Amino acid sequence: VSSPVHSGFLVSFMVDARGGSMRGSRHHGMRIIIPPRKCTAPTRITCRLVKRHKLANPPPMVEGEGLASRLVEMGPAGAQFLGPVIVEIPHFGSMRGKERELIVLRSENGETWKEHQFDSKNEDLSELLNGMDEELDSPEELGTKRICRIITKDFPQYFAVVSRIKQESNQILSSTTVPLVQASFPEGRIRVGLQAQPVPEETVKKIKATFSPIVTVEPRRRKFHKPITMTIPVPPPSPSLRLLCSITGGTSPAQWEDITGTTPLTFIKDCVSFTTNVSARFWLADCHQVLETVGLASQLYRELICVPYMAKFVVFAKTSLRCFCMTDDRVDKTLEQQENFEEVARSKDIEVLEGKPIYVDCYGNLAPLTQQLVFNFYSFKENRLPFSITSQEPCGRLSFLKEPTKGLPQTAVCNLNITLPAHKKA
Amino acid sequence: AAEAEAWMSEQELYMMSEDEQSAVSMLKKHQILEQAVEDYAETVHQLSKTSRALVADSHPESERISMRQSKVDKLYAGLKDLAEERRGKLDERHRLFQLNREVDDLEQWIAEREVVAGSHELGQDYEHVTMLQERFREFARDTGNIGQERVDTVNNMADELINSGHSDAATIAEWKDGLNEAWADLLELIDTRTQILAASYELHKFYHDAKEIFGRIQDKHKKLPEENTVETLQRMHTTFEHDIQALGTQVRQLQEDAARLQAAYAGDKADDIQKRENEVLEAWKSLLDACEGRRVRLVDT
């Protein structure tokens, strides 16, 4: 005779046993589903994204990791549900097609962080014939929609969505991203994982030397009982081959040194097999000038650690032009709607790099008075670009590219066609 | 006059440079320099008149003089213009900082009231939750009134700065979003606290009502043994039958409450509600047996 509820919430809402499918009206895509007969008392559930202040000791991300979404505050600090409940949070972290993964971190109190594991998943039973139902179409549908689903029997204080290079792990290992990567440790007890990083030729050329996939074992700086055999692909040639290694632990930034002397570099069919008693980052660098490698590697490593973010480009205008690159930022920005701008150009989501500047070019329309102009993309920040701006059509097309050049053409990241309003002369 | 150019250049250096207390003094100093610039204006007007020296028609440096006096005029007029340009920029900083204090004051206020509504104090007994609910409802009424006065005031104040054309009004608007977000977070928190109280009061009423009905049902059962036939028959039909009809309506009404509440809870809390409701029903039925024999009912109902 009674039915579960379904409504939109900014940050908090009340839910009883009857049920609750709640869409976050603030942050689109943020959904929490409480099945029926799941929570026992009437309870105030809060799902908040932290921006007012910086939390003490935020989640411990190693080098190259980065937060997919912001940090989420749960309402009841240690709420317990008999059945499982669903918390869906939109992120803006680009996965580069199975190259990257998402680890789910939780803080119980706010001091320490650990990983959230869920026992199993059975969508029909967990829903418990919920009227709203509509668990998003498929895991692939989640991937295309950039929605992170967390299934849980109890809320912690803080949840964290983290983007990292995918790690292959078990309780004789090999990468599921690059095939010819293998670590041979005699079997027989704890869990360890291995991550293999891809390297692109174009990005390498931007900053003489060739490089292999960065092979990494997640529990770094650990001495195994016996040495472990490592098999790594051979970078193409440009003794020229060299092996780089980094033992910096945890969050600490990596330090690279050349270990060619301490490493018997056996060869097995376009590979390098060798032994090591210590767990650390390993890299092959093939270039004839031996002394240069480490420094040049550092120039690449700093570039590689940068994390990708599916950003949208937006162009406002007023008779003058504002260019935003945004991820979860409030669309129809309040400053513009106040200052009488208009949303002349939107974009599809295109992968861009945080901390890396993106250059703006205009083709077929007016140019700024100005010395070219640029801005960087900082994730979860509002990146604002102001603009000081024949007689047939006002149409113009502007492009956004990571590289500055006119010597050769560089493929663009975004390409927005735009059209002015011509209300009054400016 | 030759030194005056250097003297003006010194002011030119001071005027070009980059909390509320710093800005308020900043502008305090700058106002004095503008008054000092007016003093130079008195020097420039006479100096220009003296430099002219047209009647004498002397020509030793007349071409040079006509340029030095003109440069002095350009030097002073540009300097005065620069004094005004900074004055506006400094005033913007003071106005910007002055408003920021209020936004933070309002933001602190919401943190305070948020704490009040954060308080998830369920209540010791029914007599308590009634005070909680009838107090909190007044606190929400007041907050909702005065809070909106201030947020409207700060938005009016912030709208004036951005509408005024502030050189810093990108973080003014960022602040506006931040405040209005947090305000609409408090109202929303307030509401879910109001709801949570209503739910507690509804359960507390059921538990308190259960004690009273169970007491009344069994208490009226004790009166039955005490309980000629013409007098008793009239006494039962006239008063006793109406008494139970009233008592039964209360039991059924209590039963309705049990069910309404039963939707919203589950598990141990639901079980205890069923235990008390079953407790009332068992006592109620127990009275119905003992009472059945000596009972007069009208044909109609």
UniProtKB/Swiss-Prot annotation, chain A:
Domain ZU5: 9-164, 166-287
Coiled-coil stretches noted in the UniProt entry, renumbered to this chain: none
Sequence positions bearing Phosphoserine: 138
Subcellular location: Cytoplasm, Cytoskeleton; Cell projection, Axon; Cell membrane; Cell membrane, Sarcolemma
Tissue: Expressed in the heart (at protein level). Expressed in skeletal muscle (at protein level). Expressed at highest levels in brain and testis, followed by skin, kidney, liver and spleen.
Function: Membrane-cytoskeleton linker. May participate in the maintenance/targeting of ion channels and cell adhesion molecules at the nodes of Ranvier and axonal initial segments. In skeletal muscle, required for costamere localization of DMD and betaDAG1. Regulates KCNA1 channel activity in function of dietary Mg(2+) levels, and thereby contributes to the regulation of renal Mg(2+) reabsorption.
Subunit record text: May be a constituent of a NFASC/NRCAM/ankyrin G complex. Interacts with RHBG. Directly interacts with DMD and betaDAG1; this interaction does not interfere with DMD-binding and is required for DMD and betaDAG1 retention at costameres. Interacts (via N-terminal ANK repeats) with SCHIP1 isoform 7 (via C-terminus); this interaction is required for the localization at axon initial segments (AISs) and nodes of Ranvier (NRs). Interacts with PLEC and FLNC. Interacts (via ANK repeats) with IQCJ-SCHIP1; required for IQCJ-SCHIP1 localization at axon initial segments (AIS) and nodes of Ranvier.
Protein name (record): Ankyrin-3
Shown residues within the full chain: 984 to 1450 of 2622
UniProtKB/Swiss-Prot annotation, chain B:
Tissue expression from the record: Isoform 2 is present in brain, heart, kidney and liver (at protein level).
Superkingdom of origin: Eukaryota
Per-repeat ranges for Spectrin: 1-92, 94-197, 201-298
Modification sites for N6-acetyllysine: 211
Subcellular location: Cytoplasm, Cytoskeleton; Endomembrane system; Cytoplasm, Myofibril, Sarcomere, M line; Cytoplasm, Cytosol
Residues carrying Phosphotyrosine: 201
Function field: Fodrin, which seems to be involved in secretion, interacts with calmodulin in a calcium-dependent manner and is thus candidate for the calcium-dependent movement of the cytoskeleton at the membrane. Plays a critical role in central nervous system development and function.
Family: Belongs to the spectrin family.
Oligomer status and interactors: Interacts with ANK2. Interacts with CPNE4 (via VWFA domain). Like erythrocyte spectrin, the spectrin-like proteins are capable to form dimers which can further associate to tetramers. Interacts with CAMSAP1. Can form heterodimers with SPTAN1.
Protein name (database record): Spectrin beta chain, non-erythrocytic 1
Natural source organism: Mus musculus
First-to-last residue of the parent protein present: 1601 to 1910 of 2363
